Every structure is written in structure tokens, then in C-alpha cells.
Design a protein around this ligand. Sequence first.
Ligand SMILES: O=C(O)Cc1n[nH]c(=O)c2ccccc12
Length: 222
Amino acid sequence: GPFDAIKQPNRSEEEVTQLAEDFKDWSKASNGWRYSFITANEKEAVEDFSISGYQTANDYLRATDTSTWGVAGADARQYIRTVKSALNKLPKYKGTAYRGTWVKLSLLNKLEEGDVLVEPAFTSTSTLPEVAKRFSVVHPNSPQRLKRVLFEVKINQGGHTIAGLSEYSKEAEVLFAPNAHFRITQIERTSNHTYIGVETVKASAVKNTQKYNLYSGEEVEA
Ligand SMILES: O=C(O)Cc1n[nH]c(=O)c2ccccc12
């Protein structure tokens, strides 16, 4: 049953909450020597990323022209740099994670196994499909048709757990720095939903395939 971990009914609140707490505990217990260099500003930035910080950071990273942001752009650049610095001091996660989002139908209709998807913003994922699906429920106004997409992400690089610092949100969250690349390993289009299996890949390792910007739908040059 491909993607049944996503499709199937959700586990109970008790189980999902316990799994998220275990993941937070594991994250803290996995802090390494690099964590001893984390700063107060980095902790403040990561701790509030999931509730509000990601909204501004990801808009800046998706902006067509950042000179239009004025003074807020300087703040956004500082925040992005701080979160990226913090991430490299936090434990890696490898294994499977999940991401719910909305993607342009016009891009989805082009996608094949082996294509590479590039996320210009930070990429937020959860180890829990229940949490990922929560971000597939509504979208803001769009003149282009958007479709619900549930990603099953095989992570072998790039992902770091922020769950140890996210005291105020128990989402079992694994975060990627901006511009993360994901190679499609399987696609299913069924009952108006789209399920995509992807594997993390290093940008410099991507060769002789087609890259697409996941947000804009535009081709990304080799
Ligand atoms: O990028 C976003 O809009 C947030 C987000 N989207 N999708 C997810 O699956 C997810 C999981 C955990 C924490 C944030 C998220």
C-alpha cells in the first residue's frame, strides 16, 4: 500500500502527543559538541520559528524582489542567518518524515520520477504524518489551481531536528535550510490528492535531470 502511512486514519491524540514528546526528548539527548556553541539569539529564533518566525522568513525567501521589503528586509536577513547558524548546531535526523503543502497543478502535471524539487524557503517536515496533514487543509487565495500534496520524505542529509528547542509547539519537526533539493522517487495521483515520495539530494550532485522550483513552478537551470 504505497503512501498508506499518510492515507490511513490518524493515530490517537495520546499516541501522537507521546511520540512528539519522545522525539523532543530524543532531540535534546542527541545534542552534540556543536550545541555547546549555540547562542541566546539562536535559541530565541528557533523557539519561535514554528509559530510565527517561519511566516516572515519564508516570505522573504520566496519574494520576487527583496529590495521592496525596506527595513523589514534587514531584519528578515538577520533572522534567516540566525536560524541557519542554529540548525548546523542541532542534531541531524535521518529516516522518514512528512510534509503537507499545496502545489500548482501546472507543476504537478509535469512531474516524473527522477525530477528534483527545489524549495526556496525553509523546508519544515514532521516525523508524524498526522502533523503534516494539518498543513494540507486550507490555502490562501490563488488564481492558479493548487492541489493538496503530501510528501513522504526520505532524509539522508540536510535535516535537523528543532523539536528539542520548540518548547511551545509539539510537531516533531525536522527543518531544512533554504534551497533544499528533493529527488522524486514515486508519485501517486488519486481521488484529487497527490502523494509524492522524495529523497534528499545534494544540489551539486544533481546531474542530467530537470529541477523545478516547488513554489513558483519554474524550471531551475542545471
Ligand atoms: O512550511 C509551512 O508552511 C509549515 C509546515 N508545512 N507543512 C508541514 O508538513 C509542516 C510540518 C511541521 C511543521 C511545519 C509544517
